[PDB]
Structure formats: C-alpha cells, structure tokens
Design a protein around this ligand. Structure first.
Ligand SMILES: [Mg+2]
Ligand SMILES: [Zn+2]
Ligand SMILES: [Zn+2]
Lengths: 1337, 49, 99, 50, 79
DNA sequence: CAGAATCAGCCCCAATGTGTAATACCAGATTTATGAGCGCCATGACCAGCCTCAAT
DNA sequence: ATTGAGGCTGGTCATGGCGCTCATAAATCTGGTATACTTACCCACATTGGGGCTGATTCTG
C-alpha cells in the first residue's frame, strides 16, 4: 500500500485541513450523565459520535440513518471508532514560537538568522526591542535596542523606522529574509575569505539553507499560529470503578492553553495596558512551550499534587516511550509461563507440557476440531464441553498436539539459542520438563527458574519453527564451530567412572569374545565394572570412497569400555573410547562423530551417551563425606616455619636493617611460598593416595577418592576449590585494595574464626557487587553493538575481488597462543597458495578450506595463507558469500540472505557477563632479524642502529616461534642465521637509559657550547667521572637557547666523517639532560658509548573504548610522510616537527609538548606512519597513515587478546563485520567533475558508484578519504531517520528530519519491524526481491 | 520446617542440576502440607440505572 | 499461567499484565533480535501484528482457526497509527504516500 | 526420604550441611536407642543411666 | 516422525525456498481437492509435504507445471 | 628592532545526553419531568372462494 | 373422468397498547453589585559549544 515515509513541517493551512473543527471551551463533561459538552476537548460534534450509529440526542439510533448529520445537535451518525482518528485545531490569538526549533542543541532559528540564542531569547522574553526594515535611519537590520534607546529613536524619527518585539518580530524577520540573496552572499564570502572556523560556519550555513530551499518548507512556518489537538481516545477520560475518573496530563495542558488564550482575547478586546498584554503573551508562550515539551525551557510544571506533567515529547521519548515499549516489543497472546523441571526420559526434540496449559492455549483448535467431528453442534456447545472437561476433549487435544511444535524462551535472551522449538508431550502436573542437554545453551538451572511458551499460529510459522528453530537443527554454537549440547556433570561423572581401569579386580586377564559377554560378566556379578581384560572387537573404517571396511583384532581394554563400545556409531575407531573419557574427551568424540557421519547419528549418539551416563552414575552412587577432605601431616610444620621466618623478619626490621616496604614484601613473599608449598603437598597427598597390591608386593595407581574423581572429570570443582577445602585459602584483600599480611590458615573442614570470616565478607561483597554491575554494563554494550550492525545482510554470491587479509599465527614472544589452523579454517583464500618450497602450485584460489585442507596445510607446514574478508568486499549494500566464508554453525557454506550482523553482534555481546633487559630464548632455533641496520662495533658485538628491528626465531620447519623488539643501540651476541641453543642469552641492553652511540668512528670535539650557557661542570662524588651535563632550554639562559650542543665525528684530517655508502656528515644535537660519556681529545670507535640520556585496565572498558573509537589520553606522535627530519626552532614550545621529503615540499609542522620524550635524532630518516614518540596509538591516525587493513588488524588483535586473556573463544569474522560497519562513512577531498563539496561527508557506497559511473563515462572521478567513527556515531548517522530516532536523541533526529524534508525508504530490518511487515532477512528475502523486481518494471 | 532422612547420591539424573527427589511417604504422611486462607469481597454499588 | 484470548489495553490495543488481568507474556527486543538472527520472518510478523495489534487481524485469525484454515492477513498495527497521530499533533508533518 | 546430588557440595564449598547431617544421624540413633529401651520397658534405672 | 529435515535440505537448498515450497504444498493439501502423493501415516500436512519433498517428486518447478496444466484444463473446459 | 593589534589555536567553563532480566444575596432565563392527546403497527376475531379429495 | 364438500387462498372491522408531539413549572444555571483601611512570592562520564586567552604572522611608531 506504500513504500516510503515522508517527514516535514506542517503549514497552518495543512493543520486547518487536518482539523474537523475548532475548540473554544475547556469544558469536558457536565458532571451529570457524563455527556460530552459542546465546543470542548471532547466535543461530540467535532470528534464524532460516542456510541455505534447512535445520535447524541437520541433522534437517530439505527443503522438506517447512517451517513446523515443530525439537525438538533449536529452529530454525525456513524461508528464510534472515528473518535480515535479525528483531530481539532486551536486558533491562537498571538504567534508562538516552537520550542523544539528554538531549544534544540543547534539553534536552528538562531543560526539561520545569524542571531545569538541569548539575544533571541531576550527578544522573545519581551525584554528588548528589535529593528526590522530600518531604512535610512542608520540602524541595522538586526540591531537590538532597549526601552530607553527605542524611546530615544522614536522621539527623533516617527516614521521610516519599524521595531517590534517577540514572536511577531521573529516571524516578520523570517518572512523578510531572502534565502537566495543570503546564499549568494555566503558563497561570495566563502570564496573571498580564508579562515578555518569561518569556512566551517559558512559551509554549515550554506548546507542548511540549500536544503531548506530544496525542501518545500518556509522560514515563517517555524512560528506556530494554529496548533493541532490530539483525538479524545488517545487522552481518555473513562470513569474508574467506584465513581471516580482517570485523566491524562494532556487534557490539563490543553485546558491551561485554552484558558490563557481566552484571557488574552478578552484583554485584547478590553484594551488592556501594554504591561498586562505582555504578561499574558508571556504566559501563553510558556503554556505552549510546556505543552509541547515540559521541563525543557525553565522549570517543569508540577501536576495535580507533586509530580511534574507529562508532555508529548515525554511520551515519544524515553525507554518507556512508544518506540521502545509499545512498538519494538509488544505483549502477545497464546503465551504461558511456569516453573521448569528436568524430566530425563525426554528426547532431544521433545519437551514436557502440562495438560492444563495446553488446554488453555489450544482453545480455538479444540473448538474447530469439535465442530468438525460433529460432537458439538455450536461453538457455544463446544465451549461448554471444554469448560465441563469431558472425556473427549482430552482425546481431541491429544490429536491436535501430535505434531504442532511450540516455542520455549528464557527471560534473558543473550544469543540466538535463547529461543528453541520442541515437540510437546502431555504430562500431569504444573511444571515444564526441559531436556538436560539444552540446559547449558539456555543457561538455566532448576532452583526456581521459569520459562515462557509460545505457540506458532500459521502454517508458515509452524514450518519455520520446525525447519529452523528445532533443537536438533542447531547443535553447533554460532559464535564458535564447537558443539553446544555436551554433557556437563552427571553423564561425565558416569562415563569417567565407567572408563577408569583398576590395578586388581575380579576376573583379571580374562579373554572375552565380545562386549555382549562382557556385559554378561558385569551384570552377573562375576567380574568388576573395570578390569583389564582382552576383548575381540570389530571396527569399521571409511577409508573407501564412501564404503565401510570391517577389521577384527584383539585389543587390551576394560569391561566398562567394552560395554560402552555398543553405543558408538559404526563409523569411528575404537581408540576414541580407550581413555579416561573426561569432558574434553567426550566433546572431542562428539565433534569427530558429527564431522565424520552427519547429523542424525550425532543426536542419536548424544542421547545414548546421556542415557548410559545417567544409568551408570546412578549405579555407582558416588557420595561425599567428612573423611574425603584429607589434611596433610606437614601443614602445621610449614605454618611453624613460616611463623618463625615472619618473626625473624620482624626482628630484622626492628633492628633497622630493612624498611617497612621491604619487610612487607618479604612477609607476603614468605606467606605466598608457604601457601604454594602446602597446596603442592596436599595435591601430592590426595592425587595418588589409593595404594593397593596385586598378586605380589605393592603398586600405586591414580587415587579413588570421590572428590578427586569429581575434580578430575571436570564435572564440578577445581584446584582452587580443593585448596580451599583441604588447605589454607591464602591471602585476602582489604577494602582499600591492598593485601593483608596475615593470611587465613584454616580451611573449611576446620573452624574459621570471627576475624577470618569478617575478612572474607569483604571479598564476598565485592564479588556480589561486581556481578551485579557486570550484567548491567553488558546489556548496554550488547544493545549498542546490535543497533549499529542490524542492516547488514548477505545479498550477493561472489563480488569478484582480489583483495584479502594476510593471516599469520599470533606470537607474543614465547609459546603460540593461536595456531594458524584456527584462524584459517572456514575461510576462502584470496590468492592461490604456493608450495612451501615455492616449487609447485598448492590448493587453488577460490576453494573453501575445510578440515581436510587444514590438515594438508599443517602437514605441508605452510607458513602463512592469505584469505578474503568482509571489509574488502566489493558488494554494495551488503556482502557476498565468498568474502564472508562459511557460517560456523553448519557444515555447508553461508546461505544467501542471512542477516550476519545480528549474529555477529550477539556472539560478541553474549560473553560480556564473563569479563571481570636480557633476552632468554626458550627453544632451539635460528636467529632471524627483520629491518635491522646493524654494524660491527669495536668489541665484536652486532650493535643495531635501527628502531624497527624485530628479533625472530625460525626453526628448521621454517615457522616463526619467537618475536622480540630490540631496543636501539642494544648489545647482540649472535648474528643472523647462527644456530643457538635453548636458554641462551643473545641480546643485552640497559632499559634505564638508551645509548646515543654513533655508526662511525673518529674524533669527538667540543664545538658550539659554553660552560654555563648550555653545559655545567660537575664532579661525581663516588665514581669521580668528569662529564658535561647538557641543560635544557628552561634551565639555560635565553642567550644560549639558539646554540644547541653540536657533537660531530671528525677524522684525523679534521674533516667530517662520512657514513659508509653516503656522504652526509653525522652530527648529533644532544638534547637536555644528555650526559656525555667521553670528553675531547680521546679517539672513539664505531659502536661505542658516547652519551647517555635518562628515560592496563581490567574488565572490558578497554573493549568499550575500542568499539567506541575513543582517542587515547596521550597519543603517540607519528610521522606524516617519509623523509628526513629538520628540527624546528623553539616557538613558545619544545620543538617544531618539519619533515623534508626527497623532492617534495615540507609545509607540515607540529606542536610538540616539552614534557614528552622524543626518540628521533637530528639526522634520522623517518618513514610514513613511523613512530616519533612513545605511548598509546590513536586508531584514527593508524587508519589515516596505514590504510584500513592495519587498523582492522589492530582492532581484531586487541579484542582477541582481551577475550583470550579472559578465556573466551570468539571468531574474528564478527569483529571484522563490526569494523566494516564502523568504517562506512567517508569525506570528500576535492570533486573532479561530479557536484560535491570540499568537506562534505557522505556514504562511501554513493561516492564509489558515482566514481564508477564517471569512469564508465567520459568524465573524471573525484577523491575521498575514509573516515572512522564510533558505533554510536555510525548508528546515529544513518540514511533512515526512523532507525536513528528509535535509538537515541529522538527530538534532535526528528527536528533534523523535519527541517531537511527527508524521505525514508524502508530498506532495512528495524524499519520493517516498526512498520509491521516481513523483514528482508529470512523467508521474506524472496518476497522483498519479488516486490523490488515488480516495482519500476 | 521439618527434619528429613537425606541421602547423597545421583539417581538416574532426577537430581541433575539442583533438583530434589522426594519419596511418596513424605506426601503420604502430610509432612509438608500447608494451609492458606484468602478473602473475597462482593461490592454492591448504586448505579444511575 | 496461560492465555489464548482476553482483554486489551485502552490507549494501545495490546494485552495486559501478568496473572492479575489474565494477560499474556511480553515479547521483548532481545527476542526480536533472536528471531531476526533466525529466518523466522513469518513468525516475527505473526508475533508483532496479528497476536498483538491488528484489530481485524486477530479476529480474522480466530475465525480462520475455527474454520480450520491456517492463514493470516498482516494488516496494520494500531501502535504505529497512534505514534503517527502523536507526531502529527506537533508541528511536524509525517504521512504515507501511495505509488 | 530425600535424595540429593553430591555434585553441588564441592563447588559451593559448604561442609556445614554434611556436618549437620552427621549430627542429625547421631541424634536419631540416640533417639532410636531411647525409643527401643522405652518399648522394652525393663526399668527406670537403665533409662536414667543411659 | 520427521525429527530432522537434513535430507530435505539436501534435496532443496538455501533452507528458505524449502520452507516456501513446503508451505505451498501444505496449503494446497489443506485447502482444495489436492491429495497426497505418499501414503498417509496419520501425519499432518507439513509432515506429509516434507516427506514428499524428501522423496524428490515435489519442487517449485513441478508445482508450477502442475498449476499451469490445471489452469489450461480449466480454460479448456469452456465447452 | 620592539610594539600591539586582530586571527586561529588552545583551554576553562556550561550544557545536554546516557545508564539491565520476566461570601453574600439579588433578579431573570432555561430545562428536565410529569400533565394529557393523536394516532397506529400490529393482537385477536371473523369470513368470502380457489385449491385440494371422493363416489359411480 | 364428473360433480358433491372439506382446507385453505383472497379481504372486514375495528382494536389496543405504544410512541411522537404540546404544554406546564419549579429547580438549575448565569450575570450582576458590595465603599473605615489592607500595596514586590518563596550521581559519574563523554561530548559539543561559548567565551577568554596564546601565540605567531602582519603591520607599526
Ligand atoms: Mg537458577
Ligand atoms: Zn442529534
Ligand atoms: Zn565479496
């Protein structure tokens, strides 16, 4: 019926055409029979009838008289639902300005009229006069005069001078303004003048005025003359039960406005004095402003008793506004909720449902079935039978609920798996049963949790719920390609107990012909559950081309494992059930069985595993007792030794040998060592405490303790819990944040005292508060992340691009924390891979790297494969399937139409509640260096004169195992390609002071320095070395500020020493506080010391700042372009950074603070994007200097490092999608041929397509620079104003929309949800495509 | 409340996460039965009709 | 608690609260995001139009279910009309064009 | 009468329930002995001594 | 039964055109004189249409051809 | 060569915008409720043959 | 296959409680005037914008 929405500002004529009448009286009802009064806020003749086809006076009360208006009262005879869409108007007696356009964050009227907001408010407040059309009176067009000045001007001239005051004057000025003349004058000023601020202001003014001219709005329409009235029903006056009434605040605001307008009309008729007229006008302005937006201009008007009134803007805005509370989410029918239970007998695709809940839900279906079967003659009879609950309604319900799925949802929906579909099973009771396997996905427990039930209604909804939301259809997590239905506690414990051999048991060394007779021997009581026996087994292998090959052999296994072999599907080797079978082993087995067989065997195997684990756990019957906590016999001795050491340290402190801080450090270190010793001793005593003897002397095996098994099967508990149960719990933390020097020496088995309990209460309360706040922060972060990438949908199949992202393993200077298999599996390669030896062609370019390809790459030991990404996709308004890769929730490739942005945001935001000098080589390798300007010194060490040198360790496979940053002028023992051994020091340096060594040899002479002017003469008291300390600019005098100490190496002939390979002299201008090691008259050598210059938040605010693109507090200065450096003259500051290129000009200059240390020397050539200072790096500068790849790599690396430190595994595809969404806007440098401004900021896709069209034609394209914005800024800057208004700043968004006259095409998901139609993401993608292809055919 | 004879062991997954398994004799002996009392009021008002 | 059909609010034709006025559960923004992550466009449409706001939609769906036909008409939500009227009450002109 | 899951004791770190279970079992054993002695109703000196 | 629709998704890809075709077939069975092409094991229209799709004798092309043939036969019945 | 003026660059101060899971009386004019009355669609009571059966 | 009667199709004559219309009238609803002298109420961050400096290139006495 429609395809777009248009927003603008309403003219008085249009407002009058909207109105069905005028409202002249504030009367509501007649307090007797509650009839609607005439010409009131609920006037029947204006707003339609009250009852259906009933006249107000009663004359006409039948449908026969529909359409004719009464003559006694005028009330039209029609439906009463027209009272909900009919509006009135009020004729104001004086013009009133609009509060939104006056008090919006940018003063629209103020900057349109080039008048200050303060002055405009002064004129509106009836304080000062304003001149309009001054003429030849020597008065400006916007000059403001006081009362005395206006009187003086009127006395001199009675004509050719017009002055008004207030909204009338503002409207007159707006009408008199000439938009075209203002545009041409501002363009001429832009062309003539040259200033940054003036240019920006004139550009904003020209843009606003050009958009106003393009739109059909008029400047004078911003001042309200006729205002609309809300329909009665939207502000009801219904009688409350008990003879009382309920009313909204809009009725009172309208009453106030009407009464003040009537008073103003009366005063104007009665020729009231000017002061009274002005007071009444001010009251009317205030009343209209408070009606439109209460509390914006001044103090809010209080309501009936205490609370302030609610305005239309208040209803529109807020979390409880229409957009968020009643339009984005809405209460729905056919819903139910109750408490959940386990019901372990259920299958994965079914759940339990109470009979009463299903009878109440499927009432229309039962009615229809009863009518169709002929049991009930009428729907009323069917309802009576259902109320009576006969014996046939239950059969009808069983028939209808046989194959009708339902929806189960938990109140926190963190990710996609918060809502699933199941197949109902009628049960007796009032509690829902939920499958244990989906409990981890649902994040639900059984301590009073509740869940909601939703019934799909239509055929399409039922089929969608069966094919997409079914529990068996989603077993893999969308965040990471891992199973999500793995057993947690009871099944894991049962399988661990089953598959756990013993040294000596019943029937040891028995030869078994099959697991069948193994279970025989188990059940019959003639053999133990776990005894070492020989069993003949047959296994099947898929080595053939889809066929299975059977092989039979004798294996060494146990009875438990042989019995468990029955449920394994006939596709897996026997080695996957011949271990302890913990939780990780169970998950790996499930994943292997999935990836090898398919889906149905996976779910069947999972159900069989859960059944067997439950049964065998119940058969074992493990318990917990007070004797399970075994106390070591050395705890007291260790405590005594620790106390003796503490006493000795206290005596030493009392002797004055050590300070308080050193004493505290020693005490805490001793206590930590004692705690570690106690924990290690108790681990050793508990882990192998079970000792037995088989047919001989004695032997030791793993312990049989119940708590040890519980902690070693990964079901529950951990090392920290065991330490807190059977040993001291360590050091606590005072409320200040430090650590108390006295630890807690008592465990939970023994009795803690009041002091230790009171100490632990602090940590318990801190933990509870942190847990309370983490959820509140994560909700906001998740909402902000979802709202920025909700419009991203896969729309193409292959964009045909050649770009990609270079993927390498993560090395931090030690052990690899991210193998290359994880970062490459599931991605498509951007370029064809070659052989490791660069001899033959490897896997082709456009292949999908599955597990087989990954295994082949691992076997071949490929160093680094490059892959495509979504940030380099060429698809406009979406991404292609090939660039995205594959959906890491199903085995196949990503389908077309999927709204990947929502999945990415949900996966990123779900684990948010979980978040709070000498190089020593590790392993043998070959020393490798990259970008090193090394030279041989006089001692043989390979000194390095480059600040971009990375130390790398390459093994004989050709893989990188180590990565270190080498400081400048560092001593290196080895070289490049020299074989070394593990644990060998190769590099040494002084971190407390960087060297100023030179790369050339010769003489050092003293030129351009005077003792006292720039240097001081100081003698060391201890060492006695004579050195000349260089004073900085502030320490020295003003005369010597232009004479920097210049040290230059000269040879024996007196000339400057030429650097090998070049001829530029190497002179170094020492900065302040530069201690010179050697004086004049002593020859030096290359690589020798000459001068010495002295030199992380937790949680996820780092993640929040990274996603919001917040600039660092102390950004690192970077080099704009490559070239030499030419220090600048102090200009009320430290230095001027001027970089001279090889041949280009050097207009660039920077303001360097004097409190920041600098690294570059006088004659050092810098590169583009190279660092000049030290500190946090700014992402905007990173982008501007190194493209988009560097900044997306930096963001991905930072977020992955934070999540890995927190222990959460998330794929980087989501991060990449978020970065792409954040990298959507771009500014214009200069327009080649297409109309564009020099600083306008538009969408990147628009300029891209415009440039493609220009290049296809004979014209010349333009140039642009990519811009980086935060998530909220990108969400606010959206082509569709509806989505922007739904998120935040509704008043500002609506004001800007109205002013610009913007047109909104739906073209999205949130807009289609708001309007109430099919979204173009799932099944509606094809409908939307068909609609687009039909339109403009 | 009441004092009960409890055992610590898994029983066929009926106490998987935090669930409590109760024998029939507990409900047979009415050991946990509670009495609840509610008040309902009927109001007779005067209408214009 | 459970509900199939009941009473609706006055200003916005939506279901009432919980267990006090015999009302239905609330479908929130998180649930909408989950359904958008899924492909259940038809389920989302029937959730936010027929079961909640469409005055003719709900009765038509009820009659179709009684008659044995599982089909729906999407209609137009009353909440959007209320929002449009509220915005038009200000000095802002917003309308839907047909083409 | 009640069957409880031992998997919740080590993670929650509350041995008070186990200690109270042991104490209640000892008290119920003492009460059973007293009830059996009362049922046999031999004398009152034995009851006093116990 | 129809625990999973993996075979149907293999037969017809994209997991959405499958839903559209199955909804079309189930609506045709529920309203109209259409009859199932597979034996009726007391199953709903959705399950019956999913089984027909899995068997491989029902798809969008076949449905369009059947609709065209029915329309042609209706038009030819003008006598 | 030092002076201070009028422009951009920089910095201090104000402002808005965010923040989770089911008194008194007086006179003159108006209107709703009970007055009956004309007048009538429809209740209860006839009353002529065309429509529906019988013997010869 | 006719001519001798019952059941049922056409209209008689008022008939009778109901509803619309006329008219009376006290209760309800509106407007109006009072003359000793009475004079001013009663939380923590992040961002943009406005106003006051802060040099730094232009010109000056
Ligand atoms: Mg819980
Ligand atoms: Zn009327
Ligand atoms: Zn692409």
């Amino acid at each position: 019926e429609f395809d777009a929405i248009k927003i603008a500002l309403a003219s008085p004529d249009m407002i009058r055409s909207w109105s069905f009448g005028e409202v002249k009286k504030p009367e509501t009802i007649n307090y007797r029979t509650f009839k609607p009064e005439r010409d009131g806020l609920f006037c029947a003749r204006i707003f339609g009838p009250v009852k259906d086809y009933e006249c107000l006076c009663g004359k006409y009360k039948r449908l026969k008289h529909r359409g004719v208006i009464c003559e006694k009262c005028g009330v039209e005879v029609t439906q009463t639902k027209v009272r909900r869409e009919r509006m009135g108007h009020i004729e104001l007696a004086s013009p009133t300005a609009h509060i939104w356009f006056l008090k919006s964050l940018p003063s629209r009227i103020g900057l349109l009229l080039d008048m200050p907001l303060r002055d405009i408010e002064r004129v509106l407040y009836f304080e000062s006069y304003v001149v309009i059309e001054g003429g030849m009176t020597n008065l400006e067009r916007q000059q403001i005069l006081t009362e005395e000045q206006y009187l003086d001007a009127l006395e001199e001239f009675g004509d050719e001078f017009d002055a008004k005051m207030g909204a009338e004057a503002i409207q007159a000025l707006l009408k008199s303004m000439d938009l075209e003349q203002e545009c041409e004058q501002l363009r001429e000023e832009l062309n003539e003048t040259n200033s940054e601020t003036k240019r920006k202001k004139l550009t904003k003014r020209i843009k606003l005025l050009e958009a106003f001219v393009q739109s059909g709005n008029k400047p004078e329409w911003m001042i309200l003359t006729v205002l609309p009235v809300l329909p009665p029903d939207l502000r009801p006056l219904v009688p409350l039960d008990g003879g009382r009434f309920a009313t909204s605040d809009l009725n009172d605001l309208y009453r106030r406005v009407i009464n003040r307008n009537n008073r103003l009309k009366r005063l104007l008729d009665l020729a009231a004095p000017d002061i009274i007229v002005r007071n009444e006008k001010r009251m009317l302005q205030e009343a209209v402003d408070a009606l439109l937006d209460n509390g914006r201009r001044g103090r809010a008007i209080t309501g009936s008793n205490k609370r302030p009134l609610k305005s239309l803007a208040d209803m529109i805005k807020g979390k409880q506004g229409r957009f968020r509370q009643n339009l984005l989410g809405k209460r729905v029918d056919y819903s139910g909720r109750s408490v959940i239970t386990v019901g372990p007998y259920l299958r994965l695709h079914q759940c339990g449902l109470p009979k009463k809940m299903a009878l109440e839900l499927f009432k229309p279906f039962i009615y229809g079935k009863l009518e169709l079967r002929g049991l009930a003659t009428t729907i009323k009879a069917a309802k009576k039978m259902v109320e009576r609950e006969e014996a046939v309604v239950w059969d009808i319900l069983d028939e209808v609920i046989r194959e009708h799925p339902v929806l189960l949802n938990r109140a926190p929906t963190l990710h996609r798996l918060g809502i699933q579909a199941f197949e109902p099973v009628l049960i007796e009771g009032k509690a829902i049963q939920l499958h244990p396997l989906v409990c981890a996905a649902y994040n639900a427990d059984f301590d009073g949790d509740q869940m909601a039930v939703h019934v799909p209604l239509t055929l399409e909804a039922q089929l969608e719920a069966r094919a997409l939301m079914m529990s068996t259809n989603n077993i893999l997590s969308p965040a990471n390609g891992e199973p999500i239905i793995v057993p947690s506690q009871d099944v894991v414990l049962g399988l661990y107990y089953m598959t756990r051999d013993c040294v000596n048991a019943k029937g040891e060394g028995m030869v078994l012909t099959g697991p069948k007779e193994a279970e025989r021997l188990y059940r019959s009581g003639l053999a133990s559950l776990h005894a070492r026996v020989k069993v003949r087994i047959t296994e099947y292998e898929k080595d053939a081309n889809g066929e299975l090959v059977a092989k039979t052999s004798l294996k060494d296994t146990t009875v438990g494992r042989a019995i468990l072999w029955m449920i394994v599907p006939k596709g897996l080797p026997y080695s996957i059930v011949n271990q302890a079978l913990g939780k990780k082993a169970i998950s790996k087995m499930l994943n292997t069985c999935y990836r090898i067989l398919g889906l149905k065997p996976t779910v069947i195997f999972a159900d069989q595993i859960m059944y067997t684990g439950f049964a065998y756990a119940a058969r074992s019957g493990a318990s917990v007792g007070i004797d399970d906590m075994v106390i070591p016999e050395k705890k007291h001795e260790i405590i005594s030794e620790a106390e003796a050491e503490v006493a000795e340290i206290q005596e030493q402190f009392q002797s004055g040998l050590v300070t308080a801080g050193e004493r505290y450090n020693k005490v805490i270190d001793i206590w930590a060592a004692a705690n570690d010793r106690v924990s290690k001793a108790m681990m050793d005593n508990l882990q192998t405490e079970t000792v037995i003897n088989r047919d001989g002397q004695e032997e030791k095996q793993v312990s049989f303790n119940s708590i040890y098994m519980m902690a070693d099967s990964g079901a529950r508990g951990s090392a920290a819990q065991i330490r807190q149960l059977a040993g001291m719990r360590g050091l606590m933390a005072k409320p200040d944040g430090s650590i108390i020097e006295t630890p807690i020496t008592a465990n939970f088995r023994e009795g803690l005292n009041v002091l230790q309990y009171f100490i632990s209460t602090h940590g318990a309360r801190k933990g509870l508060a942190d847990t309370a706040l983490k959820t509140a922060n994560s909700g906001y972060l998740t909402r902000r992340l979802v709202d920025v990438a909700q419009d991203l949908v896969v729309t193409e199949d292959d964009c045909g691009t050649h770009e990609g992202i270079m993927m390498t393993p993560v090395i931090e200077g030690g052990d690899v924390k991210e193998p290359l298999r994880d970062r490459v599996l599931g991605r498509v390669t951007a370029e064809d891979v070659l052989k490791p030896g660069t001899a033959d062609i490897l896997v082709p370019r456009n292949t999908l790297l599955h597990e087989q390809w990954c295994d082949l790459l691992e076997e071949n030991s490929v160093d680094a494969v490059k892959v495509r990404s979504v940030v380099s996709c060429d698809t406009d308004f979406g991404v292609c399937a090939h660039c995205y890769g594959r959906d890491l929730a199903r085995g196949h490739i990503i389908n077309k139409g999927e709204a990947i942005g929502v999945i990415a945001a949900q996966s990123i935001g779900e684990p948010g509640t979980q978040l709070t000098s000498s190089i020593q080589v590790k392993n043998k390798g070959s020393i490798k260096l990259s970008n090193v300007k090394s030279v041989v010194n006089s001692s043989g060490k390979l000194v390095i004169t480059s600040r971009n040198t990375e130390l790398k360790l390459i093994d004989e496979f050709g893989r990188t195992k180590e990565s270190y940053k080498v400081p400048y002028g560092a001593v290196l023992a080895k070289g490049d390609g020299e074989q070394v051994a593990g644990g060998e020091t190769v590099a040494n340096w002084d971190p407390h002071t960087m060297p100023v060594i030179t790369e050339v040899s010769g003489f050092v002479r003293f030129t351009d320095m005077i003792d006292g002017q720039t240097i001081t003469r100081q003698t060391d008291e201890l060492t006695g070395l004579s050195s000349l300390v260089v004073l900085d600019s502030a320490e020295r005098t003003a005369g010597g500020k232009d004479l920097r100490p210049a040290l230059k190496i000269v040879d024996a002939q007196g000339n400057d020493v030429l650097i090998p390979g070049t001829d530029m002299p190497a002179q170094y201008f020492l900065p302040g506080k530069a201690i010179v090691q050697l004086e004049d008259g002593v020859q030096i050598s290359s690589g020798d010391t000459l001068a010495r210059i002295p030199q992380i938040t937790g949680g996820l605010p780092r993640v929040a700042d990274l996603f919001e693109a917040r600039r660092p507090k102390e950004p690192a200065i970077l080099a704009e372009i490559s070239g030499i450096v030419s220090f600048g003259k102090e200009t009320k500051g430290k230095r001027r950074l001027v970089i001279t290129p090889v041949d280009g000009s050097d207009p660039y200059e920077e303001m360097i603070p004097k409190w920041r240390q600098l690294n570059v020397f006088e004659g050092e050539r810098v590169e583009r994007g190279d660092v000049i200072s030290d500190g946090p790096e700014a992402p905007h500068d990173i982008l501007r200097l190194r493209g988009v790849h560097a900044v997306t790599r930096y963001i991905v690396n930072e977020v992955q490092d934070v999540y890995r430190l927190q222990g959460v595994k998330i794929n980087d595809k989501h991060i990449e999608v978020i970065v792409r969404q954040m990298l959507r806007k771009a500014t214009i440098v200069n327009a080649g041929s297409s109309d564009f401004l020099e600083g306008e900021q538009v969408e990147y896709s628009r300029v891209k397509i415009a440039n493609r069209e220009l290049e296809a034609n004979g014209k010349v394209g333009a140039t642009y620079s990519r811009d980086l914005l935060g998530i909220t800024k990108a969400s606010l800057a959206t082509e569709s104003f509806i989505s922007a208004a739904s998120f935040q700043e509704t008043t500002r968004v609506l004001t800007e929309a109205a002013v610009a006259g913007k047109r909104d095409e739906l073209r999205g998901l949130k807009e289609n949800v708001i309007v109430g139609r099919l979204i173009p993401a799932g099944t509606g993608y094809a409908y939307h495509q068909d609609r687009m292809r039909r339109r403009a055919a | 409340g009441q004092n009960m004879r409890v055992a610590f062991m898994p029983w066929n997954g009926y106490n998987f996460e935090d669930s409590i398994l109760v024998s029939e004799r507990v409900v047979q002996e009415d050991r946990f039965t509670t009495i609840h009392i509610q008040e309902l009021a009927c109001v007779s008002r005067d209408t214009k009709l | 608690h459970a509900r199939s059909t009941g009473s609706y609010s006055l200003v916005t034709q939506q279901p009432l609260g919980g267990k006090a006025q015999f009302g239905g559960q609330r479908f929130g923004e998180m649930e909408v995001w989950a359904l958008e992550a899924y492909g259940a466009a038809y389920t989302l449409q029937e959730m936010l139009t027929v079961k909640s706001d469409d005055v003719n939609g709900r009765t038509k769906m009820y009659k179709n279910i009684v008659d044995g036909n599982h089909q729906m008409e999407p209609g137009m939500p009353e909440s959007f009309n209320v929002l449009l009227k509220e915005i038009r009450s200000l000095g802002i002109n917003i309308e839907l064009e047909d083409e | 009468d009640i069957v409880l899951n031992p998997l919740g004791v080590p993670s929650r770190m509350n041995i008070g329930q186990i200690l109270e279970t042991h104490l209640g079992m000892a008290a119920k054993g003492i009460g059973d002995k007293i009830n059996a002695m009362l049922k046999q109703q031999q004398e009152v000196a034995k009851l006093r001594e116990f | 039964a129809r625990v999973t629709v993996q075979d149907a998704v293999e037969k017809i890809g994209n997991r959405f055109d499958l839903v559209l075709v199955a909804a079309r077939r189930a609506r045709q069975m529920q309203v109209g004189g259409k009859d199932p092409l597979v034996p009726e094991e007391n199953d709903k229209t959705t399950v019956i249409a999913l089984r027909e799709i899995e068997e491989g004798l029902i798809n969008n092309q076949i449905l369009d051809v059947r609709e065209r043939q029915e329309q042609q036969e209706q038009e030819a019945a003008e006598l």
